[PDB]
Design a binder for this molecule. Structure first.
Ligand SMILES: *[C@@H]1O[C@H](CO[C@@H]2O[C@@H](C)[C@@H](O)[C@@H](O)[C@@H]2O)[C@@H](O[C@@H]2O[C@H](CO)[C@@H](O[C@@H]3O[C@H](CO)[C@@H](O)[C@H](O)[C@@H]3O)[C@H](O)[C@H]2NC(C)=O)[C@H](O)[C@H]1NC(C)=O
Length: 225
C-alpha cells in the first residue's frame, strides 16, 4: 500500500464558493498511484444560519496529478479535507488539513407613498451568505456605496449621494416600511427631507463583517422626480 500524503504539503487557496486544493505525492509509493480520494466536511461557519450536518462529500480524483478544485462550497465556512492515495492494490493512510472560504455579500431582496419631500418603501431583510448581516444602509443619490457620507457634509465633499439611515440588522428582522426624509436620525445619519425640485434614486444596502473582511451589496428601491 502507498504511504501518507505529507500533511503540511496540503495547501489551499480559498475563494467565496471554491477552494483550490494542492498537495504532494506520498513520501514513499508502492506501485503507481491510480487516484486520490478526498473527503470534505464543513467544520464551522461564520454564517449564523447554515446547516453543516450535510455539508460533506467525497471525491475520487483519477490520475496522480496532486491538485483538485472544489466548487459549490458555502461562503465563510471552514471545510476539513482528508486525502488518501490509491495504488491499484488500494488506499494508503489518510492525511488531513482544513481551509476556510471567504465571506460573500448578503443576499439582497428584489413605492408606497411619495410626497413632495418624502418617499416611503417596503424594506425587506437581506440574508446571510457566509456571515451575518451587520448593518443596513439607505443611500440617497441625486440625478454600491462603500464610503458613507452624512448629509451635512455632502455639499462640502461634493458627493452625488448621502447616507440617509443606517440600522443594525436586529432592526428590520421582518419586512417593515421606511420613509425616506422623515427627518429622524438613524445611527448618527440624518434622514434629511428630500428637496421637492430635485430628482433622486434611492438604494437599500446591506453589509457583512467577519474574519476582518467586509462585503456589501445594494439594490435600488425607488426613484423620485
Ligand atoms: C503518475 O502518472 C504518470 C502518467 O501515467 C498515466 O497515468 C497513471 C495514473 C497510470 O494510469 C499510467 O498507466 C498512465 O500511463 C506516470 O507516468 C508513466 O510512468 C510509467 C512507468 O514509469 C511509464 O511507463 C514506461 O514508459 C516508458 C517510456 O517513458 C516505456 O519505455 C516503458 O516501456 C513503460 O511503458 C509511462 O510511460 C509514463 N507515462 C507518461 C505519460 O509519461 C507516472 O509514473 C505516475 N507516477 C506515480 C507515482 O503514480
Amino acid at each position: 500500500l502507498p504511504g501518507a500524503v505529507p500533511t503540511e504539503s496540503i495547501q489551499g487557496s480559498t475563494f467565496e464558493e471554491k477552494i483550490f486544493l494542492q498537495w504532494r505525492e506520498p513520501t514513499q509509493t508502492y506501485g503507481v498511484i491510480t487516484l486520490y480520494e478526498i473527503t470534505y466536511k464543513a467544520v464551522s461557519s461564520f454564517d449564523p444560519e447554515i446547516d453543516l450536518s450535510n455539508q460533506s462529500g467525497r471525491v475520487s480524483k483519477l490520475g496522480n496529478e496532486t491538485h483538485f478544485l472544489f466548487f459549490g462550497l458555502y461562503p465563510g465556512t471552514t471545510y476539513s479535507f482528508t486525502i488518501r492515495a490509491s495504488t491499484a492494490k488500494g488506499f494508503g493512510p489518510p492525511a488531513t488539513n482544513q481551509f476556510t472560504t471567504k465571506i460573500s455579500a448578503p443576499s439582497m431582496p428584489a413605492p408606497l407613498n411619495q410626497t413632495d419631500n418624502t418617499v416611503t418603501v417596503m424594506l425587506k431583510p437581506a440574508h446571510s451568505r457566509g456571515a451575518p448581516v451587520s448593518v443596513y444602509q439607505i443611500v440617497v443619490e441625486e440625478e454600491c456605496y462603500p464610503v458613507p457620507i452624512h448629509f451635512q457634509n455632502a455639499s462640502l465633499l461634493n458627493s452625488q449621494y448621502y447616507f440617509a439611515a443606517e440600522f443594525p440588522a436586529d432592526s428590520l428582522q421582518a419586512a417593515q416600511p421606511f420613509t425616506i426624509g422623515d427627518n429622524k436620525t438613524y445611527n448618527g445619519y440624518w434622514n434629511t427631507p428630500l428637496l421637492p425640485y430635485k430628482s433622486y434614486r434611492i438604494y437599500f444596502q446591506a453589509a457583512s463583517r467577519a474574519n476582518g473582511e467586509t462585503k456589501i451589496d445594494c439594490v435600488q428601491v425607488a426613484t423620485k422626480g
